[PDB]
Each structure stands twice: as C-alpha cells, then as structure tokens.
Amino acid sequence: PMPPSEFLDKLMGKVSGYDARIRPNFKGPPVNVTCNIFINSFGSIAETTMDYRVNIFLRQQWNDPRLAYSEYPDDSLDLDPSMLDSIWKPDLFFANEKGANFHEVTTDNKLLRISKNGNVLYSIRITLVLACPMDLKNFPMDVQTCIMQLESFGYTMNDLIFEWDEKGAVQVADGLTLPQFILKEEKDLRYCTKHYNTGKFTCIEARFHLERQMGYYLIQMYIPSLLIVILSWVSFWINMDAAPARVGLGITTVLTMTTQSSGSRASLPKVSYVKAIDIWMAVCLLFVFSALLEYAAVNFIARQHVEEMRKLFISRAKRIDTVSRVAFPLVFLIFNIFYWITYKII
Amino acid sequence: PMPPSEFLDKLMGKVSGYDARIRPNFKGPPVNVTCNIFINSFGSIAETTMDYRVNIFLRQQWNDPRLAYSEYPDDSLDLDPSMLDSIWKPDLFFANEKGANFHEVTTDNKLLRISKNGNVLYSIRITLVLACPMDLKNFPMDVQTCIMQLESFGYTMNDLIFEWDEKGAVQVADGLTLPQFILKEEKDLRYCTKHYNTGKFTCIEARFHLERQMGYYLIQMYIPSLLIVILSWVSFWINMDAAPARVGLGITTVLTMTTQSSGSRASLPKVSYVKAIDIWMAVCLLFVFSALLEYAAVNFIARQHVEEMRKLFISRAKRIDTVSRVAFPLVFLIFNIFYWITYKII
Amino acid sequence: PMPPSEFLDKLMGKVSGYDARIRPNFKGPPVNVTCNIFINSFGSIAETTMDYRVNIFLRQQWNDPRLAYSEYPDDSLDLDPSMLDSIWKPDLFFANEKGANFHEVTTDNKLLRISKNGNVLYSIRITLVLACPMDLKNFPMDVQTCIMQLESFGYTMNDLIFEWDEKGAVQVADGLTLPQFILKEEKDLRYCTKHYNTGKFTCIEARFHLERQMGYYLIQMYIPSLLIVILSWVSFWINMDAAPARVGLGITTVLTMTTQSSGSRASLPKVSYVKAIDIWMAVCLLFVFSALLEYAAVNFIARQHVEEMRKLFISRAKRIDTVSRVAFPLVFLIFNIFYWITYKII
Amino acid sequence: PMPPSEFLDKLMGKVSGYDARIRPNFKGPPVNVTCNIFINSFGSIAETTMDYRVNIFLRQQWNDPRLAYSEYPDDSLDLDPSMLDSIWKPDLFFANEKGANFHEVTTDNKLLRISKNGNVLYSIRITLVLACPMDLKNFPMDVQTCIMQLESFGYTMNDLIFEWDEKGAVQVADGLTLPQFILKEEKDLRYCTKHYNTGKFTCIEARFHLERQMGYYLIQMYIPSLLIVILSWVSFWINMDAAPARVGLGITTVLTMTTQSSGSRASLPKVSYVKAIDIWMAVCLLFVFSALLEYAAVNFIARQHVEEMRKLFISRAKRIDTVSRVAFPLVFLIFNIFYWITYKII
Amino acid sequence: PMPPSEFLDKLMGKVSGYDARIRPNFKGPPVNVTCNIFINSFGSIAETTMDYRVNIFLRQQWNDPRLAYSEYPDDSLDLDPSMLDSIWKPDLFFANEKGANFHEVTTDNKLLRISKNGNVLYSIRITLVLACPMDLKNFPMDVQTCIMQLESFGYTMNDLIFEWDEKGAVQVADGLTLPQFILKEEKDLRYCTKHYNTGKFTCIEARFHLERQMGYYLIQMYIPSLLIVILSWVSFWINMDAAPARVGLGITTVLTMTTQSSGSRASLPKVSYVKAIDIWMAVCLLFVFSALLEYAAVNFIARQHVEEMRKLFISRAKRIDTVSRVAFPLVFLIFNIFYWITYKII
Ligand SMILES: *[C@@H]1O[C@H](CO)[C@@H](O[C@@H]2O[C@H](CO)[C@@H](O[C@@H]3O[C@H](CO)[C@@H](O)[C@H](O)[C@@H]3O)[C@H](O)[C@H]2NC(C)=O)[C@H](O)[C@H]1NC(C)=O
Numbered sequence A, B, C, D, E: 001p002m003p004p005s006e007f008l009d010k011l012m013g014k015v016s017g018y019d020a021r022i023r024p025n026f027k028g029p030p031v032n033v034t035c036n037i038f039i040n041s042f043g044s045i046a047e048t049t050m051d052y053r054v055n056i057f058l059r060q061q062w063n064d065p066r067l068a069y070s071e072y073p074d075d076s077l078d079l080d081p082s083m084l085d086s087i088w089k090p091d092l093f094f095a096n097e098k099g100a101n102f103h104e105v106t107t108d109n110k111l112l113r114i115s116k117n118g119n120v121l122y123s124i125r126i127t128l129v130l131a132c133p134m135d136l137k138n139f140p141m142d143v144q145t146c147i148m149q150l151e152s153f154g155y156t157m158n159d160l161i162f163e164w165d166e167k168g169a170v171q172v173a174d175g176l177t178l179p180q181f182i183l184k185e186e187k188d189l190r191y192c193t194k195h196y197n198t199g200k201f202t203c204i205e206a207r208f209h210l211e212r213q214m215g216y217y218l219i220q221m222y223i224p225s226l227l228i229v230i231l232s233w234v235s236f237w238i239n240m241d242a243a244p245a246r247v248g249l250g251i252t253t254v255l256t257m258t259t260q261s262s263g264s265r266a267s268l269p270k271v272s273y274v275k276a277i278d279i280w281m282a283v284c285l286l287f288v289f290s291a292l293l294e295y296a297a298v299n300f301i302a303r304q305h306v307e308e309m310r311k312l313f314i315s316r317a318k319r320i321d322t323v324s325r326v327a328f329p330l331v332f333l334i335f336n337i338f339y340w341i342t343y344k345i346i
C-alpha cells in the first residue's frame, strides 16, 4: 500500500527519535562493520612517486536496531542517494589516501539497502591513489607488496570495529590485467590497529602481492647485453697482428654498452641501494673493456719484440691468445649461472 | 492558457503523489530504458595509460505512466535542468569510467522532454576517459577494439533493464577524424550482464574497432630501415682489398641502426610479449652486422694467404664475394615477403 | 526613490507572473539572441592534442518583453550575479568545448543589464580549450583555420536563433600576440545549423585563420641544413687522391644530418601523410650521402688503374671530378627553386 | 553589552534598509576603492607558456556610509567570512587571470573589518597564474617586465574607481627569493583604463621588473663554449705535417659544439626572432670549423708541392701557419669585446 | 537519558546565547590554541619547483568556557562533522600553502570532542604542498631545512595566540621513509610572529632537517667518473711510440666524460651559484683532456727529433713519461682528499 520512501521517512525522521548523528547500540557494545572490496581497475603503478591507482566498490555492512522494521511486507528497502545523509554511516577512511574522489556521473554512484532486522548494506565507488613503498633491491625480479588499509577516523575501538567478511573479503574483476605486473591470488588480511595520543582506532588491511613481467626487460636490455659480449668475443677472432679492425670493434662494444647504460635507469627512482639491473650491466661494461685491454696485450708484444727473434714474438702472444679465448666464456658462464639462480630462490 | 512550467509543477509536485525516489511501474514489470549515444569528440588514445577520451551525448528514453498528461494541448513538455532533480531518472554509470565529468558552461548541458503518454527523453553531455586494454602483438598493424559499457548501479535486473535502440544506437559526428586511427563503421552491440554478490545488474555495451595509420611509422622507421640495408650492400661494392672505407661504412650502418633503435620504443608501454616493430628492426640490426662480419671475411684471407701463392689469395675471396653479393637480397626478400603477408592476413 | 534592486524584485518575482523557466515570446516567434566575443587571451595551441586555449568575453543580447519597465526613471538597470538565476537566459554551449570553466575570483565575473524596452545584455568570462583539427601537409608554411561554434542545447530552431551582430562580431584585445602564429583579421562568420534525431538546433560559428612564424624553423633547421650541404661541397675541394680526410668530412655531414633529423619531429603528432619539414630534410640526407658515394668514385679508380698506365688514371677521375663539382649546385638550386615557389603559391 | 555580531546583524540586515546589491553613494559620486597587495610567493615563471604564478594578499579599502555606526563603543568591528556575502563588495578581477583560486583551508582565508565612520578593510588570499609576454631578443641578459592589472567587471568609471594607496602600494615578503630572477624594487604603478563597447571600466596596474641570473648559463654554456675554442687553438700546436691527430682533435671540437648546441634551446619557446644565446653559439660553431679548414690548408700544400722543391713546400705553409695562429685570437677577442659591451648598455 | 547530540543542540544553539562568530574569552585575555601535527606521508620533494607534499593530522586544542557543561554524566562529548560549522574554530592557515585541500572520502575526515570544563580537541586531515627554498651549494652533500608555519589570518595577537604543546609537538608515522632523504629527529620549534600594516599576527613554525641519500649519486656518477680517470692512466701504459690506440683511448675518455656530463644536471633548477656535482665533474673533464695533451707531448718529440740523433729522441720522452705517470695520481689524490673532507665538515 504505502510506498517504501514514504514508509522510510517516518522510520528515520524526527518522529520515532532517530538521530543520524548517533551510532547504533549507543552506550553499549561497539558497532561491528564488516567490509569487502571489488577491484574494478588497478594499475598505473608509479615508481617515481611510489603509488598506484585503484578503482573499487567499497561494500560496508553493519546492523542498526533503530532501522529494524517489522510490519512492512518487503524484505529489503533500498534508499536512493538523495536521502543518504539522513541515517548513520561509519566514518571510514584510508590511512594512505594520497588523494581520492567519488564518482558522481548521471547519479552519485552509491547504494544503500536495509533488511528487515536492520542489517544495512552500503556500497560506494571510490577511486584511490594509494601510497605503497617500493623495495627495489632486485628490480626486474622483485615481488612488490602494496597494501591498502581501512580505518575509522572519529570513533575509537570501544565504539566501532572494522572486520573483513569471511565470504571473499577481496573480489577482483574478471579480466583485470596489468601491463607490467601479475596480481597474485593470495591476499593477506590482517589488522593494523592504530594508537595515537587521541586514542586507539580500528584498522583492517589487505595486502596485494605484485610480481613483475620480466619479459619486457629481457627483450630491451638482457638480449642486447648478451649479444655485445658475444660480439666482444668474435672480435678476437680477427687476425693475430694488431689490425685497425680491433680499434673499431673495440668501440663498437663501447658505443652499445653505454647506450644500453643510457636508457637503463630511465623511469626509476633515485634509491641509494644498488638494484639488479645494473649489477648485470656493470659486469657487461667490464667485459666490454676487457676486450679493449686485449688489444693492449697485443700491443704489449708488438712494440717489445733474424730467425731467433721473431719466433719468441708469436709464441708469447699465442700463449695469451688461446688462454684469453677460453677464459672469457669461463668468467661469463660462471657469473651467469651465479646471477640467475640467486634470484630464482629470492 | 496555463504555462507548461506551472502545469508541470502540479504534475510532479507533492500534489498527485509523485515521488522522484520511486521508479516507474513500481512493484510491477521492470523499466525498459533504451539508449543511444552521439560521439562528438574522440581520441587522445593513450597507450602508456591504455585509455581514451570521448565526448558523447547520452540519450536515455523510458516511459513513466505517472507523468502522462492528457488535457494539456501540447505534444511535448520540455523541462529546464533547474527542476531536473524533481523526477525519477535512471542511475546509469560506466563500468570503466576512470574519471568523468559533466559540462556546465553557460547552462548545465542537459535536456529533458516529456511526451503526452509519459515517454521521457533525457539527454546529457558527458566527457569520459574510458579504459580499454591494448593488445599490441603486431603493433603498427593492429586492430584495437576499445569498448564502453553502460550499467545500472542500484537497481537490479528485475527493476531496470538497459537496451540499445534499433534506430542507430551509435551515431558519430560528421567530420570526426583521428590523428592516428580509423574508426570502423561496424560497431558491435551486446550485453555484459554483471553478477555480483549484491545481485545481478544490467549492462549493454558498444565495441569500437580502431585500425591504425600505418603511414606514419612507414615514414619514420620502415624507410630509414630499408635504405641502410641497401646502404649496407653498396658498401660491399667498395674495392676488393681491405680498405679503411669498410671501417667507416661499417659503423655508418651501425650508427643509424642503433639511432633508429633508440627512438623506436619511444611512447610505448612495457609489455612483456614482443611486438612487430622490433622483429622488423632486430632483423635490420643483424643485416647491419652481417656486413661487419663481411670485412672480417676479407681479413680472414688477408692475413692467411711468388706467382703461385697470390693466385689462390684472390680466387678464394672472390668465391666468397660473389656469393655474399647475391645472398644478401636472397635472405632479405624472402624475409620481407614473409613479413608483410603474415600481417596482411592477420 | 525606490532603489533598483527593490524595484527589480517585484519586476521578476512571483508577483507579475514572471517565470525564469519560460523563454520570452513563448508560443510565438523565436528568440533572436545576438552574440559577439572579445578575445582576451589566445594560444597554447597544442598540436599533439590539436586544441587551443582561449579566454573570451561572451556578450549575449536578446529582448524580453516581460522585463520591460516603463515608470522607473533610469535607462538601464544592472543586476549583480547573486540574483542571476532569477531571469531567463539562453542555453548556449560550445560544440567543441573539450573542457571549460567560468572565472569566479573576488566576484563571479558576470554582467547583466536591462534596458527600458526589455533589451537584455549579458556578458560572462569563459576559458575554453577548443578543439580544432590540424592540417599539416606543409608544416612550417601552413595556414591553420581553427574555429569556434556556438549552439543552443535545449531549444530548437523554432524557439531560439543565434546571430552575430553586424557591429564587430569578434573583437580582439589590443596587444594580443602569439609566440608562434599570426591571427589574421579576416574572420569568417557563418552558420553550422545542426540536425540531430532530437530536432534541429541553431549554430553560428567564427573562423580564425592562423599563419605560422616561419622564422623559428628557418633558424634551427633550414640554416643548419643549408650549411652542411655547402660543407659537403667544400669537402670535395680536398686533394685529388684518396685521403683519410674524406672519411672524416664524410661522416661530419652524416653526424649533423642525423642530429638535425633527430630533433626534427620533436613536438609533432603522428600524422600518416608526409609534411614539408622532412621532404626538405630527406633531400638534405641524400645530398650528404652523395658525397659519401663521391669518395667511392675515387676508390673506383684507385684500385682499378709505366708512363702510359698512370695517364689514364688521373684523366678518368678528373673527368668525374669537374662534372661532380658543377652538378651539385645544379641539382640543388633547381630543387631549391622548385621547393619554395611551390609553397609561395600554396 | 551587546556583542558585535548581534549588533552588526541589525546594522546590515533587512532592518535599516541595507541592501548588499547596491553600491555605496548610490546615485552620487563614484566609489573610491584603494588597493595594495602583499606578495607572499612568486615564481614558477614559465616561458613556454609565458606566465608566472603569484600568491598575494589583496587588500581593498573603501568607505560605506551605510555601515557607519556611532553608539557602539569599539573602533573596529571585524566580520568573519560566514557573513561576508551580506554587505557590498567591489567586483574586482584580473584582466590576465589565466586561472586563479581562493584559499579555503581550515577557514576561508578572508578578512573584513569596519571602522566607526564606515571605512571598510577587506583582505583575501589569492593564487594567480598571471600571463605576461616575454621579450627574449637578448635571452640571458634580458629584463622581463611582467605586469598585473586590476579591473572592475560590472561597474563603469562613473560608479567605481580603483586606486593605489600612497603608503606602499606593493609590499613584498621578507625573504622572497627567486631561483632564476631578481625582483627589482622600482615597481611602476599606472592606469590601464579600458574602453569596450559596453562602456569604460577602471584599471590600475603594477609592473614588476625581473632581471635574470646570468650565472647559470655562464657555467653550463659560456664556459664549455670558451674552452673548446681554446681547445681549437692548442690543436694547431700539433706538428707541422698532416698528422691523424688533427682528424681527431678536429671532430673533438665538433662533438662538443653540437652537444652544446643540442641542449642549448632546451626549455625555450619557438620565437621567430633570433636570441643571444645562439649568436654567441653560432660564432662558436664557425670557430670550430675554421680549424677543420685549417687542416685542409695543410692538405692544400701537402698534395701540391730535390733540394729546391722541398724548400718552397715548408716556406708557404709556415707563411699560413703563423698568420692563422695569431689571427684566431684576433678575430675572437674583437668579437668577444663587441659582444658583451653591446649587452652591457642594453 | 538524553542523548549527547540532543544535549549539545541546546548547549550551542540559539538558546543559551552561543554565537559561533565570536571567540571565547571575548573582550578579555587572548585565546591560547595549542597545536601538534602527525605526519602521515611526506615527500615528492621537488627541486625544480622547490616544494614538497606532506599529509598531516592537524590537532588543535583550546578552551571555550561557553561550552563547559556540568550536569551531563560523560567526560567527553564528540561532535560529528555535520554540525561542525556551529561552534567557534580558530582561523589557522599556512603561510606557505601553495595549494592545499581537505580529505572528504566516505566522511569529512574531521574530529571534534569537548571535555567537561570546555577543553576542545579539533583534528583534521590536510594535504599540503609546502614551499621551501633549496640551498644547493654542495648538492649531493647538503642538509635541506624545509619548514612549515602556522598562522592566524583574521585575529591579531591580542585575541589569539598559537603554541606548540610540550608533549610531542611533531609526531611522525612509524615506517615513514623517503626515497631520497633522511628526516632527522631534531625538529626546531619557534615563532615567526608576523607584522603587517593590518596588525601583528601569531605564528609558530616547525623546522625539518632533510639529509640526502648520497648512495645514489655515488653509483651513477662518482664511480663512472672515477674509473674513466683510471682508464685515462692505463691508456698511458700503451707502447712508447705514437700509436693510433692513443687516438681511440683518448676519445674513449672523452665520449664518457661528456655523456656523464650530459645527464648530470638532469633534474636540477637553474641556480646561478656553482654546486658540488660539477666541481667534481669539471676536474674529471680536465683529467680526461690531460691525457689528450699527453699524446701531443709524444708528437712534440716525434716530429722534432745516425747513432747520436736517436739517443736524445727516446731519452727526452722517457723523461716526460715517468714524470707524467707518477704525477697523475699525485694531482688526483691530493684533490680527492681535499674534496671530501671539505664536505665532511660542512
Ligand atoms: C561486536 O563484536 C565483538 C567481538 O565479537 C563483540 O564483543 C564480544 O561480545 C561478547 C558477547 O556480547 C562478549 O562475551 C561476553 O563477555 C562477558 C565478559 O567477558 C561475559 O560476562 C559474557 O558471559 C559473554 O561471554 C565478549 O566479551 C565481547 N568481546 C569483546 C572483545 O568486546 C560485540 O558484542 C559485538 N557487538 C555487536 C553489537 O554485535
């Protein structure tokens, strides 16, 4: 008979004494607000700024005994967001917001429905730019753990407690992909209960493990680093005497190893510790220059050393030549097997 | 006699029991809202961010039996956007908004008119920055399909259903051009009906097929890649003996093929898979270096090998020379015919 | 006696039946709104985005017979923008807004005055980022025509018509200069009457012809392109025999012509058609490389060809030398006279 | 007894006939509003956009005889910004705003106090991004004059006149420094009275003279330009015969003079006229290349010219050598003394 | 019995004469507002703009005798931010805001509670982009002191005084790290009492000492500067005669020392004074070029100077050779010990 919006105006109005400024179960046990999120979008994970943009559906559920109706014949009463400032809502916020906003296009993207016993479902759409610190000690082979944490601002622990629901506390959209990362499915859920000089305030947090796409940096960097070192060694398969081709093929490995070192730290923050993209690349710099010294070991013999005199001349340089030819794959592949299985277990 | 705005205030006011918080056909069949868009602007299609900005006219049509007037002698009653928060409107939103806004310059750019039988036309101007994932496996020769999807936020499927109208569900402005793409005319129109733990919500979506302008990358990249490979082969039409001109014309092809590899991946995301602009260009790198080995095959003879001794010296190198001269167009044009007709059928 | 604001409250209030939701001359002839703009600022003309920012004073004039007073002894009644939502105003908008805003610093920058016969002057300050497509077939020598168009949003042609006034429909500020362009004084004024499936809507538009400053690109690009070609020819005034100076002065023209080709397409969109800054510059690339082939024509004689044998050696190369010396200004100045007078008539 | 806010509500309310929509001295002499600013922050002076951000305290003073109280025992009544829309205020705006905003953090940063005779002090905090054209004919040695101008928007000259007060019309904060400029203390104060087709409107303006920091560009550019020219001359102190060291030290001056010409016009607008950073640098380009021709004048003798024949060979080249050695400081220091004292008097 | 929000409406309403426009202790002693902040986020410390973004909790405490309740049985009455414009609050602002905003997601992030004796606690969440001047005379080894200062805007010193509380006037979040800096724990707290021509206004300020991470610039710059100088000296361990290897290893040190000088001043402002990253690097430029002159001192002997003639030829050059070999670590390590212990005490 009577429509729900007319029914609900006398359920929360000045009649029946409902005050939206007062929490449920006032002067009693605290309010148990259970939460779960639905990640629509994810990404633009900046590393200069060390933050990431997410677009979620924040669903909040609690019980309000003041809103419990008994005689109206429906099981749920929805409430459009025009009258949304008229009941009590929890003062949730994010402890690492770094700017956020609602979505208000064609309607405020907000949802509210009330069960018969007073169970309240509240769902809004938020875009967050959440801050997470980035550990980059092993940069292309790292697992970034960026978190988000949900706190009360005004109510202390003895008035309002946040929880995650057991039925899927973080849902992720179906085809949610990232251009540079993989979002793992194990999502840690734990408390971050804050203590200030004002009081103690509730917190729950979710932890997202992000693992990179190694395939990009392997193409741009690790393959043009690997081939120049092989270019460095075919350069020694030049003739035995000091040819000017060793001058050009020497700087050929120099002009590439500096160019690959030019755009190497392109989009990276200025961290003090050393990462892993350069301890690969600094080794690729000294294996360039070890071929530049290898021409000097030709010129070490060529200006130092007639049937007797010329025989020691070639015999000493070949004694360096076949040793230097074998030892360059020796010093490389021992390093190259020490490099990857280090990061395979880290 | 009586003006429409005075007539409409008693048609939707507190008299006659109209409540804007309640959908039409309440406790009955769901509301059938039919939609079509008019794309004014399009583009700024970012690929680092994988989104695109669009500027549309969102037209929504439904029937409200509460608004059906009978005695007023006009066929349509317009309603200025000052009184627009006074009737019911659908809570449409975009599932991939990534930020959006209205246009409010000199007047809120909004339109509302009401037919005699209660048919309501509602038209607004929106600017969207819609997210679309970018498949870039064959980057200059790809067909990007970027979509837009229109959902209800608060009403489930048993209360509100979106549809596309048959009479031109997507209109495009007349001279709408893109700097980098071609918008095809076949626009797929289908449903994306969402299931959450809240309920099931209606969705309709439109699919835009975008095909690139290959003419830009052919000028900056494919022509300076093609000529250096031809520069690499006239470099072998140098004299037969080991001249220093082969040192300079060797690095001449090196200084260009790295410079063309420098600004190659300029404005591109860091995708893990390999695209097609570099498997053209990596082949253009090894055909540079195959001429650098071709001087080494001159120096392979020059320091290894008197009427008998000099005759085998020139005869072996010419046996390599005329083979290497013919085989370089052989290995190129077989690749070059394998490259394009692969992407002609993809 | 009675102040104007007290007089005007009974002229447009609930007394005397004035309704701001209803256009003048309702159920009669359409409203003739005449417009003119005053461009304060102009520029930041982007070409990657193909838009430009303008800052105007939009003056609108129409007649409202409901506002015609007769007994008050003043000729014009101004109205401060606090009461500006109380009379009727046209719903003008720009069909290519791409974002715009008002100016509200220290007061809403808005102006309204009402004549005795009901003539209404309405003037506001708007900042627009107007979209214009950029034709760049001849890029440093182009004339860009970027437009702006003013439409009604809610009223059709039978209710509201926009016009330009004859008395200076576009005024420009006094010292309005642009860093890269010249705004011509001939400004085309014409109609762009839109037909949608909703109805037909009025439009008037203004066309601004923008002509570039050729002096910038002549300094950075055309002078360092011209001198290297002259550097390419003094390089042939080296000694007759194959000297190593031709190796260095060969790549001297190469290291500049690629560097000038590096920052050439610096701030340009990725258009598919070829512009004019590169068909100058591609010709400046092959006149670099024609001197690199000119050393090969020295080495074509030096390894192919004793009083008889040496006389044909110098006689053939000088036969190429004096021909190549004259023909390089021949092939250049014919092109250079064909280049500019092409664009002098376009 | 009675508090000021209760006293002031009957001083400006509906009682006593005060109307905030009506200027003081209505139908009388115009309102004399005197102004002065306090510059808190200054800078981020962009040159691509040709604007600058400033953060001021705009103090406005006028007399309102309607607000003159006589019996309340205090000399000044302050007014908090909640009731600030209740009295008359001038409609000041900036004719070159290019976007501006108020500051509203923890309170609207606004100030109002009223003297006994009706003198009103009004002070607000504004952040402006003011447009100024940039003359850059002598770019590191220029004096930029960027202005700001304060106008009425709705009141003509016969109703409202702006003035600067004699007691320090522009105050500057104490430690206000700029990273690239020096703000001179002579600040010109004059009128810019505007004439439109609407009427004539008041304007006062202030002129700020900005002089650059020459010390930055002297370090990055003028010292690495000076030393390469000295590197160009010690390069001639090589041995007399045509050595290959002149090839390397020739391009040594080329690889630097183009690199210093690469990042020279880094953050500069595309002005058509020639500035002064390049007419220094273009001269530094041809003094590089004059040493490249100086090796050609060695090779002019080396392939043109036995006790008689060799004596003219060395005697002609030394006749060029000692002349070219002295003349290079001759042509440089005459230019270098002509360069700076030109800009010392401009 | 009676709820607090109903109790508080009669405590601050129109009954009991409370006026939020009037400060506590009016016409009496000034208001003593004590402050402390809690820094949540810190950083994005720009140096081109010379500012930094901070995210704080601003806690303000004062006493209001008008709000002192006696009969209600609770010790603290909280107040939700809906009724927050209903009591008096101090008009705090930041004298170097450069733009700031509140946080309003899911609730206005604001907190208010009132003790029994009228002590008021007020806590809000602010994001500031605070301006600080950057002294960069010794750039990688500097200690930046960036401040923040809290002032009243409308109340003078005889009405409102700010103080820092003794109990931890600046708290910092637990794991607050910076990518480039270290926030020291000694935080200076002092007054910055402002004198304008309006009056004198209260100020308190906090000073944050920021010390850089030297480890980043030591890896990218100081190690590739150190090794090239050692590369410059092994280059002299080439053979004694003038070899072409000294040409290539000469420019090898040139191509790196300019490349390291290319991206050196990458993200730096254009300060006029000289910093310390280049007086390290300019010395690393002339120790590159001192090896280029060292080949000229070989060619000084090679073209100037038969059993007697050749003995003085080698004896003079070895007299330069062993002196130049020892003196290069002599001139370097004296500088290198003078460089660091200068900045160790500064
Ligand atoms: C919100 O959730 C919390 C946590 O589940 C609830 O707190 C817990 O409530 C139970 C039942 O009210 C308490 O058990 C009782 O404890 C007292 C004292 O030990 C004992 O005398 C009773 O026999 C009974 O065992 C429990 O102590 C309490 N725990 C805490 C930490 O507060 C809370 O009641 C929930 N509130 C609502 C409104 O649902």
Ligand SMILES: *[C@@H]1O[C@H](CO)[C@@H](O[C@@H]2O[C@H](CO)[C@@H](O[C@@H]3O[C@H](CO)[C@@H](O)[C@H](O)[C@@H]3O)[C@H](O)[C@H]2NC(C)=O)[C@H](O)[C@H]1NC(C)=O
Pocket: B025, B029, B030, B031, B032
């Ligand atoms: C909005 O559009 C939907 C889809 O066209 C309408 O739903 C359909 O409405 C028709 C007629 O009301 C239903 O047909 C009837 O079905 C019942 C049960 O099968 C049968 O007893 C009747 O004889 C008749 O055939 C149809 O089932 C129904 N389909 C669905 C999926 O709901 C809806 O009525 C429209 N609402 C409005 C307000 O226009």
Ligand SMILES: *[C@@H]1O[C@H](CO)[C@@H](O[C@@H]2O[C@H](CO)[C@@H](O[C@@H]3O[C@H](CO)[C@@H](O)[C@H](O)[C@@H]3O)[C@H](O)[C@H]2NC(C)=O)[C@H](O)[C@H]1NC(C)=O
Pocket: C025, C029, C030, C031, C032
């Ligand atoms: C706004 O401007 C338009 C265009 O000037 C006006 O429309 C024109 O108005 C005139 C006079 O009212 C019309 O002339 C009349 O035409 C009828 C039918 O042909 C004829 O019987 C009369 O003897 C007279 O010639 C003219 O047709 C009409 N044109 C159009 C295209 O509408 C309009 O009246 C102006 N409205 C106002 C409020 O000023």
Ligand SMILES: *[C@@H]1O[C@H](CO)[C@@H](O[C@@H]2O[C@H](CO)[C@@H](O[C@@H]3O[C@H](CO)[C@@H](O)[C@H](O)[C@@H]3O)[C@H](O)[C@H]2NC(C)=O)[C@H](O)[C@H]1NC(C)=O
Pocket: D025, D029, D030, D031, D032
């Ligand atoms: C605001 O400031 C302006 C400029 O100081 C004032 O205008 C000037 O006011 C004086 C005195 O009212 C005028 O002098 C009188 O001029 C008339 C006509 O010439 C003469 O008959 C009188 O004997 C006396 O000399 C003066 O002309 C006038 N000048 C202008 C350009 O308007 C104005 O009165 C000030 N208004 C207020 C409210 O303070």
Ligand SMILES: *[C@@H]1O[C@H](CO)[C@@H](O[C@@H]2O[C@H](CO)[C@@H](O[C@@H]3O[C@H](CO)[C@@H](O)[C@H](O)[C@@H]3O)[C@H](O)[C@H]2NC(C)=O)[C@H](O)[C@H]1NC(C)=O
Pocket: E025, E029, E030, E031, E032
């Ligand atoms: C806010 O804090 C300030 C600073 O602590 C207080 O000002 C100081 O208040 C004391 C006590 O009211 C004053 O001491 C008195 O001074 C007078 C004159 O010298 C003397 O006759 C009395 O015997 C007594 O010693 C003190 O002068 C005053 N100082 C200043 C600089 O104002 C203020 O009272 C505090 N206000 C509130 C509301 O708490």
